[PDB]
């Protein structure tokens, strides 16, 4: 049996051969929106993952959030103390894979220092503030004792501690905030240690400041111990982020979230996974078709078309 018009497919021994009926195997178009089911999507409005992690004021809505996919918009910006994350990609990757911002406040005993330091560049409410998940320790009175504190991990989940080192701009500011001429920070565990020597130097003017914060992280495995030993320039943690394992991930996309059902999410939106191959994007999340370079692949579903 034959049909009037036919579709041209390609075989081992033929560039083009006409057949009665042929289907497409490459999903090359996207709906343009991200379905919010079944995957727990978290739309990050104006907030990058690290900003919500640290506790940027305009990100206070993201506290204790959880997600199956964190969509990070291109309009996101930082509006707090100018910070800098050495190995930013690794921290972002592991935080995103953990899949929760659940922050447990721990009781740290800082003796002889002024806690809750703040700045005018990070304005919380009407007054000066700081990152909600960090604690800026400054000299109390006229001394800055060598802080030496510890926290044991007695639970059976990893703990993620986010701390930082404050690089001042001028030596006067260094000695005004921390009486030592050049302090250092050392966060260590049983298996590894990490020491930072803060430097003093002017930096490009960002949000009214020349000083910076360097953000580091330390993962305390179960049964391990954290020891923080510093004599200046320490941005102490306030607690720990509960690390996890799961199917969580992060994605950079400006697609709007929509109320629908779909399993495969690309930055171009949710796409159906009926077809085995897709050409939309090479970044995928969920049960997605395999990305291919071709924009069309015709599978013959009928007999050779001889009309």
């Amino acid at each position: 049996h034959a049909v009037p018009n036919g579709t041209l497919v390609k075989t081992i021994t033929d560039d083009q051969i006409e057949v009665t009926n042929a289907t497409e195997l490459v999903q090359s178009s996207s709906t343009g929106k991200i379905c919010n089911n079944p995957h727990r999507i978290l739309d990050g409005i104006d907030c990058t993952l690290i900003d919500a992690l640290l506790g940027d004021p305009h990100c206070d809505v993201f506290q204790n959030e959880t997600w199956d996919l964190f969509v990070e918009r291109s309009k996101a910006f930082s509006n707090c103390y100018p910070y800098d994350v050495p190995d930013y990609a690794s921290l972002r990757s592991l935080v995103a894979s953990s899949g929760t911002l659940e922050f447990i406040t721990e009781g740290f005993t800082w003796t002889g220092v002024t806690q809750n330091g703040g700045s005018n560049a990070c304005k919380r409410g009407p007054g000066s503030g700081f990152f909600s998940r960090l604690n800026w320790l400054t000299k109390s009175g006229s001394t800055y004792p060598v802080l030496n504190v510890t926290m044991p991990n007695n639970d059976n989940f990893d703990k993620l501690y986010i701390w930082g080192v404050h690089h001042p701009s001028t030596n006067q500011e260094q000695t005004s905030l921390y009486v030592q001429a050049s302090g250092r920070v050392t966060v260590s565990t049983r298996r590894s240690q990490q020491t930072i020597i803060p430097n003093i130097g002017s930096r490009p003017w960002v949000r009214g400041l020349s000083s910076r914060i360097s953000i580091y992280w330390t993962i305390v495995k179960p049964g391990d111990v954290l020891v923080i030993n510093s004599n200046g320039n320490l941005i102490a943690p306030r607690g720990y982020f509960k690390m996890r394992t799961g199917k969580s991930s992060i994605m950079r996309s400006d697609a709007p979230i929509d109320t629908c059902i779909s399993e495969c999410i690309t930055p171009n939106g949710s796409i159906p996974n009926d077809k085995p191959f897709q050409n939309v994007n090479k970044i995928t999340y969920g049960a997605c078709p395999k990305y291919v370079k071709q924009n069309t692949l015709k599978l013959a579903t009928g007999m050779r078309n001889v009309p």
Partner: antibody, heavy 126, light 97 residues
Amino acid sequence: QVQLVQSGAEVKKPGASVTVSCQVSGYTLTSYGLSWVRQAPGQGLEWVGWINTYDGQTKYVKKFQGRVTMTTHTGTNTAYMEMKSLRSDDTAVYYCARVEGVRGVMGFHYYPMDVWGQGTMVTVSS
Amino acid sequence: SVLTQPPSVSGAPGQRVTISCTGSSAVHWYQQLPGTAPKLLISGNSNRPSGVPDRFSGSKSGTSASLAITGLQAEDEADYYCQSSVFGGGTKLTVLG
């Protein structure tokens, strides 16, 4: 504060080419796409085009294909729209407006033009 | 995707105003004060942006969106456009004595 400051008024002659610039302030230009909208005097708004900063892919109306070019100077956070082969009908106010989506989607499909410049009065006639 | 809407609505200050755009296919509502850049006042289809007083409201039926202005006054009177890319024909808002 998010602000868009456009060039001064331009007075041209038919068949020439004009270049309108839009200086952004208060945000990074590559974070937002930028649409260009014209308004002939008392003729209501007419969408001209859309530049996707951060990847440079453009989209113009068929009426303006070829004779309009949009580029983005990222160093100065500036965006330029040049019109070649000006006609008399192109006398209008031109506005640059900020649109949200640059990565994954074409912004103007799903997002509005939340911030507008003051617009420049390009008059090609006498 | 032609857009249509009922033009030249005249009213005194302080009552209801309704404008109806019938998209034939996200419609957003912009306001152009005389001699001023247009201003966004309805995002999405019924959402309002920052700085827009809650007097403005949007309502979407199957394929017709409608913008309602409540208790209007001088600054609420301008030209109004619906956008979906294609713009609307424009409806003028004028005070009445």
